[PDB]
Amino acid sequence: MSASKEEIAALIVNYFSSIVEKKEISEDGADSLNVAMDCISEAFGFEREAVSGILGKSEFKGQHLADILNSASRVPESNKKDDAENVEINIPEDDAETKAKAEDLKMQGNKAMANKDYELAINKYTEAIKVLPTNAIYYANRAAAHSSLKEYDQAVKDAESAISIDPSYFRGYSRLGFAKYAQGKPEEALEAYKKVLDIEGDNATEAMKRDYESAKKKVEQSLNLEKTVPEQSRDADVDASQGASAGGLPDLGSLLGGGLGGLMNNPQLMQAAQKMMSNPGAMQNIQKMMQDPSIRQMAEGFASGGGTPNLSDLMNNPALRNMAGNLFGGAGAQSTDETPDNENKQY
């Protein structure tokens, strides 16, 4: 290659522009280089200043940088405003207070609950749920209030909801088991007062133990209610020993006896890097358009209608010939025809 031999002229004139800029050479010598640039400029039809856009055609496939520094101006370019620094303190700081400010709503709801206002408290604890729902204290408080007000359904729907958030909440189990025992529901009441005996243990009072036993009486009733039916699902029930039932289960053989050389019979390291995919292929590429690389090979033709002489036969006949080995050794020096040869006087 030699590029399009047009942008080369822009590099040439600008190179001499640098020489005459300093004027290192004689003043008259710089005049020669000066009028030279002037002439090359109008020769291709450009101006010896606006050479930058002309160079934008070939990147010099061998030079690029290092050799010639008189091409690519080392400018980082483009800086307006982008720190790309983290906020840290957060933008939604405004509403972020309500995460902990729901405590005020709780304490104001307690200013209802402790002031005999049951219905008003439950309203204000649901109002505190409206901001922060996930807290067993909200539900189990409404559970305590509802079982008192004989809303045993709502007492449950708060009690097991409070357990679902916190299984250490004693009021959760105590109001669930109370409301469910009042309805007669066995499995609920037993396990609610079991977790009294489990968690509290020595804090678990004799009354709590006795009410656990009294709930177990209801469970004894549900022993004949709760029953998973077989549904007549027959498999081993029907003729399983039918045919030749010698054993449908092998010990190892047909099971997974195939262990010709386990661990050993593995790539292990996998080795899929030194195999094909190390770096060749892909090339990134992307789509830069690059004006028109439709075919884009090189300077085809330009061979021109010049009448070449008989210069093609300058090559001549190979004058080497068998000269060094024309008669050397083999072709002349031959007496080894017979080893005795001059064996005169036989026997």
Residues 21-80 that bind its own copies (CB under 8 A): 22-26, 29-30, 32-33, 35-37, 39-40, 42-45, 56, 59-70, 77-80
Binding track over 84-103 against its own copies, x by CB under 8 A: xxxx----------------
Task: Choose which of 133, 167, 184, 325 interacts with its own copies (CB under 8 A).
Answer: 325
Nearest-approach distance from CB 28 to its own copies, in angstroms? 9
Nearest-approach distance from CB 95 to its own copies, in angstroms? 19
Task: Choose which of 246, 321, 333, 344 interacts with its own copies (CB under 8 A).
Answer: 321
Residues 209-268 that bind its own copies (CB under 8 A): 252, 256-263, 265-268
Tally of residues, the chain: 347
DSSP tag of 32: H
Task: Choose which of 278, 312, 335, 344 interacts with its own copies (CB under 8 A).
Answer: 312
Stretch that binds its own copies, among 145-153, 190-198, 234-242, 311-319 (CB under 8 A): 311-319
| Distance of alpha carbon 28 from alpha carbon 13, whole angstroms | 17
Whether residue 156 contacts residue 176, with contact meaning beta carbons closer than 8 Å, is answered with yes
Q: Dihedrals φ, ψ of 198, to 5°?
A: -80, -60
| Distance of alpha carbon 44 from alpha carbon 38, whole angstroms | 11
Residues 151-180 that bind its own copies (CB under 8 A): none
Using the minimum distance from each CB to its own copies, give the nearer residue, 18 or 205.
18
Using the minimum distance from each CB to its own copies, give the nearer residue, 15 or 170.
15
| Distance of alpha carbon 291 from alpha carbon 189, whole angstroms | 81
Using the minimum distance from each CB to its own copies, give the nearer residue, 243 or 293.
293
Q: ∠ CA 25-30-31 to the nearest 5 degrees?
A: 155
**Selection from 59, 4, 2 nearest residue 288 by Cα:** 59
Instruction: Indicate whether 276 belongs to the interface with its own copies (CB under 8 A).
Output: no
Nearest-approach distance from CB 54 to its own copies, in angstroms? 13
Binding track over 286-305 against its own copies, x by CB under 8 A: xxxxx--x--------xxxx
Number of Cβ atoms within 10 Å of the Cβ of 159: 32
Q: Say which amino acid occupies 329.
A: G
Using the minimum distance from each CB to its own copies, give the nearer residue, 63 or 98.
63
Helix axes 7-22 and 27-44, enclosed angle (nearest 10): 160
Residues 94-153 that bind its own copies (CB under 8 A): none
Q: Say which amino acid occupies 222.
A: S
Burial of residue 332, with CB atoms counted within 10 A of its CB: 0-12 exposed, 13-18 middle, 19 or more buried: exposed
